[PDB]
Amino acid sequence: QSELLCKKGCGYYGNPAWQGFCSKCWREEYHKARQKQIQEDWELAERLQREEEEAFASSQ
Amino acid sequence: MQIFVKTLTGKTITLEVEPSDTIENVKAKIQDKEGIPPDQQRLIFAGKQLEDGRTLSDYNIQKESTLHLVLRL
Amino acid sequence: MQIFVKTLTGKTITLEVEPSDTIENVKAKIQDKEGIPPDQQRLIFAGKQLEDGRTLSDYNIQKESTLHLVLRL
Ligand SMILES: [Zn+2]
């Protein structure tokens, strides 16, 4: 019972290295943030795709 | 380690890589499997287009990481 | 960092660990020294039996901390 308790409040102790979360809660957060990069990257990929197709057709 | 390259057309290439591997060498690896030439490949990770002379480690591409592939025209 | 594992039979194993190390990996470390298999090991800290898939940091095992070892039968 101190300030070191996990930030999700699941009872286990957090780690300074994992920004306050425990091992299991940090995994969920990590997966959550990774899900977001894939999504954003897919959106970037879409833009680059549209642009390559436009730049192509801007030839012949 | 292992990372994944998702195409926009429903393919996920699974590559066998090391953090030391250059982006250029990763694009050679994609050629080995998909037959797409390195200079016809745009790789994306965390909102950046991946630069040829840099390495996976330079971008913090770790275990399980997922990039995207766009073809050049 | 360094933590200590006291047996009930007059042995104190001194381990070299990191807060990120899993309980399972700590039990592998004990095997390296004592030859006791991980599945024959119960670890105790602050009144709890230590769960395999959790880490030292999950239990607030810091520098100098002392656990106990009971053998399974
Ligand atoms: Zn937690």
Q: Any idea where the domains of chain C sit in the sequence?
A: 1-73
- Touch test B–C: 3 Cβ pairs or more under 8 Å: no
A33 is in an annotated binding site: no
Q: For residue A18, tell me if it sits in a domain.
A: yes
Spell out the SS3 assignment of B1-50.
CEEEEEECCCCEEEEECCCCCEHHHHHHHHHHHHCCCHHHEEEEECCEEC
Q: How far apart are CA C22 and CA C33, in angstroms?
A: 17
Q: How far apart are CA A49 and CA C11, in angstroms?
A: 65
DSSP state of A10: S
In chain A, the number of structural domains is 1
Q: How far apart are CA C13 and CA C72, in angstroms?
A: 18
For the domain bounded by C1-73, which CATH number is listed?
A: 3.10.20.90
- With contacts defined as CB-CB under 8 Å, which chain C residues touch A15? 19-20, 55, 57-58
Q: Pick from C20, C22, C59: which is nearest to A13 by CB?
A: C59
Q: For residue A50, tell me if it sits in a domain.
A: yes
Token pair of C32 as six digits:
């390296």
Residue of B nearest to A58 (CA): B73
